[PDB]
Amino acid sequence: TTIAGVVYKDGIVLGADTRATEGMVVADKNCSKIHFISPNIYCCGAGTAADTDMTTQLISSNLELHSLSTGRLPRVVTANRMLKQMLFRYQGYIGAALVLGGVDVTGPHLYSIYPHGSTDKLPYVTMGSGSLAAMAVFEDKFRPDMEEEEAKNLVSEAIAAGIFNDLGSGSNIDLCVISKNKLDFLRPYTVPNKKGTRLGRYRCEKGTTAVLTEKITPLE
Amino acid sequence: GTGYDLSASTFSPDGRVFQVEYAMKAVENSSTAIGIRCKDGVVFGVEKLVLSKLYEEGSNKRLFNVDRHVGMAVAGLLADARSLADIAREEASNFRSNFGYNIPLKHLADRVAMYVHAYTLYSAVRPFGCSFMLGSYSVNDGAQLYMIDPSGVSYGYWGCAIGKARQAAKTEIEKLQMKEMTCRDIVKEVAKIIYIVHDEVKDKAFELELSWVGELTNGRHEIVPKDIREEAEKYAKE
Amino acid sequence: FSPYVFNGGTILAIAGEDFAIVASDTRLSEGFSIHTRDSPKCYKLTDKTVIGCSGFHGDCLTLTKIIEARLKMYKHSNNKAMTTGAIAAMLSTILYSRRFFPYYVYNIIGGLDEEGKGAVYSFDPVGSYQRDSFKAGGSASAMLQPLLDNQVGFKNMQNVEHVPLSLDRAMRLVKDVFISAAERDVYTGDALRICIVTKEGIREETVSLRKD
Amino acid sequence: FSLTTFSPSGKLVQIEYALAAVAGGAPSVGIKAANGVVLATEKKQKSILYDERSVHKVEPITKHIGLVYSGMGPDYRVLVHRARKLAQQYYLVYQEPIPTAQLVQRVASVMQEYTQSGGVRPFGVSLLICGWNEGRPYLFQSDPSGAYFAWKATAMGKNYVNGKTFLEKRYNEDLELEDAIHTAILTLKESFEGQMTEDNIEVGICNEAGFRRLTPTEVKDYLAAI
Amino acid sequence: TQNPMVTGTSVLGVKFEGGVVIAADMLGSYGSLARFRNISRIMRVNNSTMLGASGDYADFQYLKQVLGQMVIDEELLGDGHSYSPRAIHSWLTRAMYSRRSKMNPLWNTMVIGGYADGESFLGYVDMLGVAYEAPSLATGYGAYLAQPLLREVLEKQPVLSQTEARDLVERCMRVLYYRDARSYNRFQIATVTEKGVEIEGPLSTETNWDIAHMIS
Amino acid sequence: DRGVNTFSPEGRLFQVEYAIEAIKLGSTAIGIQTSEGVCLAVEKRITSPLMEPSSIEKIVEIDAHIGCAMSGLIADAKTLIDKARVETQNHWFTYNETMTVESVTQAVSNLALQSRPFGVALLFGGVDEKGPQLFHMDPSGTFVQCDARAIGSASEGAQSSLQEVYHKSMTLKEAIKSSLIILKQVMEEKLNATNIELATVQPGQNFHMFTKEELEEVIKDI
Amino acid sequence: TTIMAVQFDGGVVLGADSRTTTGSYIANRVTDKLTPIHDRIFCCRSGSAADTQAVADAVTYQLGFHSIELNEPPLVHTAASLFKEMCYRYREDLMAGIIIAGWDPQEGGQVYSVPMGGMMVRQSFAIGGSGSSYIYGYVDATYREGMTKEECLQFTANALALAMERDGSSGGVIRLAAIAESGVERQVLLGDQIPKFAVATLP
Amino acid sequence: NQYDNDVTVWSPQGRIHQIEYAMEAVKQGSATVGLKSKTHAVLVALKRAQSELAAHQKKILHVDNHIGISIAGLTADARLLCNFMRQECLDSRFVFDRPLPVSRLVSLIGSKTQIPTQRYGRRPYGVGLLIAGYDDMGPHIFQTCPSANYFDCRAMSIGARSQSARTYLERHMSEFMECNLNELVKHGLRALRETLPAEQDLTTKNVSIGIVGKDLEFTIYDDDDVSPFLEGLEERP
Amino acid sequence: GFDRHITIFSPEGRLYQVEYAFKAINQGGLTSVAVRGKDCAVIVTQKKVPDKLLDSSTVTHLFKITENIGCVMTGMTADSRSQVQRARYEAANWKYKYGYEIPVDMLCKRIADISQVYTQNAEMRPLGCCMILIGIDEEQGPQVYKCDPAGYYCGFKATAAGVKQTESTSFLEKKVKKKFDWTFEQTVETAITCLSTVLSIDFKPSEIEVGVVTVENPKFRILTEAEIDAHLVALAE
């Protein structure tokens, strides 16, 4: 799992891989590790996938309720505070490492959330098992106040480095770009890994697979 | 009246809480009290009815020490007054344990007034039948004096009186010129005012419980030495 | 961290024809250092019952004060003192009431019953008790008990008359066994407090022992 | 005692007084059209000191559930907050169904904490619910004591009787397009005393695309040519 | 509570004719670290009772706060009575025992000195709830080093005079500073008597190193 | 007034002055405490012959050295007697000795008013170190030591007769006959063995039923 | 990381490093460890970052509420009491070293230390963190009495710089906070501006 | 009268009526006197008897070696107060091994009894307490009324017709500090004897004495123990 | 019956208890005026001080709930202080749970929800105090709201509460109908002249206490004697 985010000139760009593995075997090749919170803020997940999903869904629901009650747009700082309180209440039992990014009325914000409840505001954030490669790519090729296309390219390069240099991450690149007026999900943005075609018709026709008994129950 | 002055939770047709309007009557009926903020401190004073000579030296005293630098002079129903004094002591102890140092008088008065308002808000519990002055002094904040009605809220008082004869005491209190008089002459004058208030005209002989707080006592609210303030009582008699 | 530490001390009680002797050392120590030379393990509870507490000193103190409180409560609730058997049973109930985190103490109750006969009730740290003519509790239990039962009980001795013990003879044997145990067991010594329980009351004697 | 109570022989006297209270004076008409549902109400603020963009009568409970109400607005605030919490809890339990119209019946059913646990004093507000995430629209009414009624066109104001009569005479009908909001405004006009304007009238619409509280611009546009 | 971080080193005290003297150095040992060199481990319980502790200084501060609050509450009633040092020692004993029973021990070994009713009292309580009173007391390594001198002095002199008692305490502090890693050359000496409690302050002991030339 | 807790305007709260007058509806019971022991005599007052006399019991042994006689609502007396048994057994288990009848009565009085107050009066009788003793406990959580007590519908007349027929140095043999003649005077029918229950208290005996229809040797003399 | 406070006449100066370490990887090289508890009160955090942040936020809650209910700026001693209570009641669960300083009109510049355990002490200067244990001799030897604002600022900057260059868990930039009656001024020393004592060991 | 129905409700004229009715509970009770001295505190209680066959009931309850109380009034919620005071005193013994001072115990009783005077559904403890104790400041006598407003007193009496005893104590209270133990006990006996009508007279069976002193722990004297004090009665019924 | 005694719906279909509480706000003898302007919002209420033995320093009815929101209270002072404490607690709790400061409208909504809970149920009673709270809000300009004992939170531009609130509201309606925006001189003068026309005493600059929140300068300024005197001099010119 490798997730990353950057603060560009007009907002936040979030990137993530789509390799959810059970131990050392790939289970999901298109696991959405970028989760919607509010139409202005997203958040990338890492660690225990189920805990991350439950926590991010709870935060999204609570913040949607809060925005409906207030009638205004929500704020990244509020989501950070909710996440920090929830995680620190359990003292790290929620093995969920999160990358929160969003656009508020006070400007775009990007935060890192750790399972024990630690948070900080950073121009660029990386998390996950392959976080080190993406962090190195940022440190090498980060420029403050960098435009939309260049920021997307930088995030794509960091995600690709994490994919090709960490075996437990990859198979797709998921991107999201957000600003004061734009929310654009990209899903698979670049597929640098394609399955080779199967040489020959490695298929089994009918007649094989002898059956002891068969039951047919037709419906309406 | 009738069905509206039965529980504090029942509002009057005009928008009043008659339970507290009757609880104030107990304070109005009980013995009076006086507290004056001297130039560098606050001086208390309460007359207490010796209902029978069978009692020992002054007991169930209307003066109480709620904290190291804070004292409470109460009038009204004395049992609930003592319970509220215990509540104030607990509040001061809790504040000292949590935030350290000494509880500011304004905050202590606000908290105890909020507690009293909580007791008068509901229906199962009844409003407290007592009114008291909280007096304290510190070098940083000078001398403060807050008075709490059985249902009202704390108010800053240069000099206040409560009990049987509030107006009669307050007239001479306003006659007295505070804010420039030292706490010694203020002790003498509070004794004088209390004896000006009627003591044996229609009641028994009264005892003079007077309290002290100020830089002359470096805070540390304590009862004035009665042996050396008997002469202040004598001056009040004259 | 552990909530228990062995503080030494040696207690001993003997049930006579009409007297109850409860003797104990007063040396409080743990590990290799001695806190004090005066820390009695005997505690008088009524005019006719004295207990001995040895082992963890804090638990000894707590148990003694709980016993005092329970005796006072029972006296108020029944308008009478508590019999030696009754306080023995109450102590047994208290000890097992905290079975899963027991008082690391050994209790021996010496006193006079309703009949006016010497009664000694030894106790286990977790509550077991039995009436005995004599028992020793503490670190020096292993080195003190054999002397007192082979003398008082005349065990392994033939052609000897089982004469009932006089008060003076019992006191002499108590002093002998304690002075013998003080030198072998380092926890024992520096003093000895002996409580004599009879109809006339409780008489205490403090004798000096090996100061090392 | 501490629940919905005061039911004598054959009667629900306390509930009947609550229903007399919810008679109110805010019509808050609702129309279930083929394309969607329109909930229109009247915001007749006392004097011009009050504001119309500050407080709202129509509240979006969730993505495509909108809510309009009747007398006892302070009770309605707590009720709509509870409804939002309940819908959010349902969406969290059954994650990602986009639950609006398969939830509109469910959220109306879970409006049992609304009255079946009255809270000593029953709620004094009747609320109309709209949802359209099923390929079909839904209009439901929950009253201070009952449950879902599944209305097609109704009013809950001071002149709710004549408002409903106007709705049926004007043939709320079934082929009516989404722009039955004109008929809803006309029904309000019958129970309105004044020259209704964009801030005086608040209306929310719930179609298959979702729910949206119409801004004063569109409200004035519809009110034009009436 | 469970594992102290900043620990206060040894404290000792002896009673004499008409009063008691205790002494504690002003070092807060963060393990092997002399992190805090200007902290007071001696508290004035009331006008006629003093208290010192050895161990976790945070626990000592908590006990100081609680005990001062309860003394203030006791003196607020103005009943004329007071918490006698015997009563104070018993209360601390019960508190330590209760904390041990709850398996949240207070990492402090406390020495309580007082002089009430014309008779000196000098109590002692530790983490495990073991309590007693002795004419001379010491904690930690002080009970190993300073205590033997006190015992040998008291064996020949059951009663003591104030000047020689405080001189003996100063010599014991010198010995402790000589042969204790956690010790420091800055100790407070507090004396309780009929006049009240008086604390000298940051007293220091003179070091002797003539034996340093005996290495060769 | 009507509130179980509100005090009366004059001197003493009501709804307990109502609970105490529940022995009036209850049946008569008399106990005598002598130096020989304690004699507890009650009437069963069987309404129909079909009901088994053994079923109707007003005297129940709390323990081997304590006997109790009820007068009032048998339902509430069952709970009070059960609590008395539990307290006695708990005390014996804790202290390995026989709980004093005074202590048992004190505990039952403590449990009497702590729920609408119990409306039964108990006549505890048993042996202790302070000789045989008898205690009269009343519905208003109050117990009093007594030597010869009467309770029930006609407690006034029975107590008045007992006041002059009792003397301080009597034995069991005279006490039983005095109680039986008084009972026969109070009741409506005769003192048949199937209608009268008797309980004896002895220093060296447990408290058993009075001879179980062979007690006619005491009623024939009557 | 390293955190340090000094008290001068009429104010205090705080110096903290920007590194927060996780194992041997630099989690955040620009960490802002000078959390403003109130307008004139600041917090220096060391240890478990999550625990420090949670404690600081809770104390900021309580202190702001208390100041609002008094209509008076809170005392630095009051804030230190809040921190000591919070750390002491949960010491077995919360492991954090906190340095507290600020200015109030009641006393002026004050400095308090509440390390792991929950003890409070008032000091002329406070030092804490993983990298603090390497500059004890320097901070004790090179500290004078009555130092002015600039002297304390430079001395704290030097101490933090050496703690950074020596300790492996400390690095990045230095954050300074000068608290006084006029207000608080926060500055960042980065790159060449870092006071460096170069060690040119001869070949 | 509506306003007299419940304790919580407040009368328009001032003080509430239920507590005023509560003070009638102690008024409707057997008389009991209690007086201080220089070194001793003595309680003389009238053991009211139901009938000649039954005992004279129990008064002057026992609390601790240095504290003893005398009840007057509603006996139901009086053993409860006795248990509370016993528990508090034993708690004091258990925590700091010292006899709980009488003033602090009385303050605790007042605080405990104040809450029922304000909580709905809770009747006030309509019991009059004459607490005799010996703290470090000599003997102390305290009177606790159901209004939870305690009083300290040189010599106070409560019960039926206790006003005559109050007057006698007041007239003779000057010569109370300098009196022997027997002299003070005889003063109390004369005070109590003046309460009952002339037909009644002091007997060994209908009186109880509670004495606490500096060297004398609290002891409850009755008939055989009272007889030495009852001698020299100077009987003027 | 008890329809008008407890918080239950009347047979006619009304709620009389809150209707009485609203008049309870009128009880107490005080008035307040809130005026929102082009860029600022000012609130002024009279300071009825009987006798000078009181401390005019603390007799105020306006407070700072947070760093940017200030309230003014009308009605019984005890309930007013309780609701002020509750509002301060809510603001602090919101700032703790959500990083950004609590919007004034949300704070009013929460206070009104608490009041609606109070008018619900029957154990408690509504608090007889009406709170008008103001504060600068980004993307919204100045904002003024009123929360009542019922739970209806609303009010804007010009809103008044107190005994003579109707006359003040009428005059402010006349002023706002006059289409001209008020700067940070005209808003204060409008509020002052409104309260002066309501109660014609010419308003010596000691009997009123005005709170101001502007946009360029945030925070709830409780303007001192000099500022109110200067504004009064400028107005009466």
Q: What does the DSSP assignment read for E138-202?
A: E-TTHHHHHHHHHHHHHHH-SS--HHHHHHHHHHHHHHHHHT-TT--S-EEEEEEETTEEEE--S
Q: Structurally, how many domains does chain I consist of?
A: 1
Q: E64: which 2 tokens?
A: 């100081």
How do the domains of chain G map onto residue ranges? 1-202
Q: What are the residues of chain E with a beta carbon less than 8 Å away from any beta carbon of chain G?
A: 1-2, 4-6, 28, 30, 33, 35-36, 38-39, 56-59, 61-62
DSSP C40-92: --EEEEETTEEEEEEE-HHHHHHHHHHHHHHHHHHHHHHSS---HHHHHHHHH
Asked if B125 and H8 come within 8 Å (Cβ–Cβ), the reply is yes
Could you tell me if I132 and G97 are in contact, meaning their C-beta atoms sit under 8 angstroms apart? no
G20 catalytic? Reply is: no
Which residue in chain E is spatially nearest to G133 when comparing CA positions?
E33
CATH assignment of A2-190, among 3.40.80.10, 3.10.620.30, 3.30.360.10, 3.60.20.10: 3.60.20.10
**Euclidean distance between CA atoms H213 and H68, whole angstroms:** 11
- Structure-derived torsion over alpha carbons of residues I190, I195, I197, I198, reported in degrees to the nearest 10: 140
The alpha-helical segments, DSSP class H, found in chain B are 18-29, 78-99, 105-121, 166-175, 183-196, 226-237
Distances (CA, A) of H140 to F62, H102, H130, H151, H213: 43, 7, 10, 11, 10
Could you tell me if G97 and G91 are in contact, meaning their C-beta atoms sit under 8 angstroms apart? no
CA atoms within a 13 Å half-sphere pointing along the CA-CB vector of A106? 11
**Euclidean distance between CA atoms D67 and D78, whole angstroms:** 13
| Residues pairing with D71 in the sheet | none
First-last CA distance in chain D: 50
Could you tell me if C162 and C10 are in contact, meaning their C-beta atoms sit under 8 angstroms apart? no
Type of residue found at F20: I
Domain range for residue B226? 1-238
- Closest Cα to residue A7, out of A104, A74, A83, A84? A104
CB-CB neighbours of E203 under 10 Å: 17
Q: Taking each helix axis from N to C terminus, what angle separates D73-93 and D101-109, rounded to the nearest 10 degrees? A: 120
SS3 G131: helix
DSSP chain H: --TTS-SSS--TTSS-HHHHHHHHHHHSS--EEEEE-SSEEEEEEE---S-SSB-----SEE--SSEEE-EEE-SHHHHHHHHHHHHHHHHHHHHHSSPPPHHHHHHHHHHHHHGGGTSTT-----EEEEEEEEETTEEEEEEE-TTS--EEBSEEEESTTHHHHHHHHHHHGGGSSS--HHHHHHHHHHHHHTTS-TT----SSSEEEEEEESSS--EEE-HHHHHHHHSS-----
Asked if B99 and G66 come within 8 Å (Cβ–Cβ), the reply is yes
Instruction: Tell me whether strands C118-123 and C129-132 are parallel, antiparallel or unpaired.
Output: antiparallel
CATH of the domain at B49: 3.60.20.10
Type of residue found at F216: E
Superfamily the domain G1-202 falls into: Aminohydrolase, N-terminal nucleophile (Ntn) domain (3.60.20.10)
Tell me, rounded to whole angstroms, the distance of Cα G165 from its chain centroid.
18
- Closest Cα to residue F6, out of H145, H15, H17, B125? H17
Asked if G78 and B110 come within 8 Å (Cβ–Cβ), the reply is no
Asked if H107 and E87 come within 8 Å (Cβ–Cβ), the reply is no
Q: D109: which 2 tokens?
A: 């059913």
Q: G and B: touch, per 3+ CB pairs < 8 A?
A: yes
For chain B, positions 159-198, list CB contacts with chain H under 8 A: none
- Residues E1, E9, E93, E193: which is the catalytic one? E1
At residue A187's C-alpha, the angle toward residues A186 and A192, to 5°, is: 105
Residue with tokens 């289409």: I179
SS3 E53: strand
SS3 B182: coil
Q: Structurally, how many domains does chain B consist of?
A: 1
Asked if E5 and G116 come within 8 Å (Cβ–Cβ), the reply is yes
SS3 C93: helix
How do the domains of chain A map onto residue ranges? 2-190
**Euclidean distance between CA atoms A86 and A81, whole angstroms:** 9
SS3 A161: helix
CB-CB neighbours of A69 under 10 Å: 17
Instruction: Tell me whether strands E131-133 and E136-138 are parallel, antiparallel or unpaired.
Output: unpaired
Could you tell me if E41 and E24 are in contact, meaning their C-beta atoms sit under 8 angstroms apart? yes
Which residue in chain E is spatially nearest to G87 when comparing CA positions?
E58
Question: What's the residue count for chain H?
Answer: 237
Q: B36: which 2 tokens?
A: 């004056």
Residues 6+ apart with CB under 8 A from G112: G76, G77, G79, G80, G83, G99, G100, G101, G120, G121, G122, G123, G126
Ordered by where they begin, the domains of chain F are 1-222 (3.60.20.10)
Fill in the DSSP letter of residue I56. Answer: G
Q: Taking each helix axis from N to C terminus, what angle separates B166-175 and B183-196, rounded to the nearest 10 degrees? A: 140
Sheet of G125-128: strand order equals: G125-128, G3-8, G11-17, G174-180, G183-189
DSSP chain D: --SS----TT--HHHHHHHHHHT-S---EEEE-SSEEEEEEE---STTTS-SSSS-S-EE-SSS-EEE--S-HHHHHHHHHHHHHHHHHHHHHS-SS--SHHHHHHHHHTTTTTTTS--SSPP---EEEEE-TTSS-EEEEE-SS------SEE--STTHHHHHHHHHHTT--SS--STTHHHHHHHHHHT--S---TTTEEEEEEETTEEEE--HHHHHHHHS--
E contact test, residue of G46, G93, G114, G121 with most E CBs within 10 A: G121
Q: F112: which 2 tokens?
A: 């009497």
Distances (CA, A) of D91 to A60, D100, D108, D190: 11, 10, 15, 39
Type of residue found at F174: E
Fill in the DSSP letter of residue G26. Answer: E
Q: For G117, which of E5, E33, E38 is closest by C-beta distance?
A: E5
Asked if H10 and B22 come within 8 Å (Cβ–Cβ), the reply is yes
Tell me, rounded to whole angstroms, the distance of Cα D41 from its chain centroid.
8
Q: D111: which 2 tokens?
A: 């409006």
Could you tell me if B4 and B11 are in contact, meaning their C-beta atoms sit under 8 angstroms apart? yes
Tell me, rounded to whole angstroms, the distance of Cα E68 from its chain centroid.
17
| Main-chain phi, psi angles of G103, to 5 degrees | -130, 135
| Residues pairing with E53 in the sheet | E110
Residues 6+ apart with CB under 8 A from I46: I30, I31, I32, I195, I199, I207, I208
What count of CB pairs under 8 Å joins E to G? 39
- Closest Cα to residue I189, out of I207, I203, I201, I206? I203
Per residue in A139-177, is it b (16+ CB within 10 Å) or e — as a string? eeeeeeebebeebbebbbbbbbbbbebbebbbbbbbbbb
Q: Which helix (H) or strand (E) holds E113?
A: strand E108-116
Q: Exposed, middle or buried, D12 (CB in 10 Å: 0-12/13-18/19+)?
A: middle
CB-CB neighbours of H162 under 10 Å: 25
Q: Which helix (H) or strand (E) holds F174?
A: helix F172-186
Q: Which helix (H) or strand (E) holds C112?
A: strand C105-112
| Main-chain phi, psi angles of E12, to 5 degrees | -135, 170
Could you tell me if G101 and G88 are in contact, meaning their C-beta atoms sit under 8 angstroms apart? no
Q: For A70, which of I97, I103, I138 is closest by C-beta distance?
A: I103
**Euclidean distance between CA atoms C187 and C32, whole angstroms:** 9
Cited resolution, angstroms: 3.5
| Main-chain phi, psi angles of F98, to 5 degrees | -85, 120
CB-CB neighbours of B118 under 10 Å: 12
The alpha-helical segments, DSSP class H, found in chain C are 57-78, 84-97, 141-152, 167-184
Q: What is the phi-psi region of residue I72: left when phi exceeds 0, alpha when psi lies from -120 to 50, beta otherwise?
A: beta
Ordered by where they begin, the domains of chain D are 1-226 (3.60.20.10)
Could you tell me if C34 and C28 are in contact, meaning their C-beta atoms sit under 8 angstroms apart? yes
Q: I121: which 2 tokens?
A: 């149920």
Distances (CA, A) of G169 to A21, A115, G163, G176, G188: 33, 21, 10, 19, 19
**Euclidean distance between CA atoms C79 and H82, whole angstroms:** 14
For chain H, positions 76-95, list CB contacts with chain C under 8 A: 86, 90, 93-94
**Euclidean distance between CA atoms D184 and D195, whole angstroms:** 16
Domain at C1-212: CATH architecture: 4-Layer Sandwich (3.60)
CB-CB neighbours of I155 under 10 Å: 26
Q: For E5, which of G115, G120, G121 is closest by C-beta distance?
A: G115
How do the domains of chain C map onto residue ranges? 1-212
Domain range for residue I122? 1-237
Type of residue found at F185: Q
Fill in the DSSP letter of residue G201. Answer: -
CATH of the domain at I29: 3.60.20.10
- Strand segments, DSSP code E, in A130-188 are 174-179, 183-188
Residues 6+ apart with CB under 8 A from G30: A122, G18, G172, G173
Distances (CA, A) of C100 to C53, C59, C91: 20, 15, 16
H contact test, residue of B48, B56, B66 with most H CBs within 10 A: B56
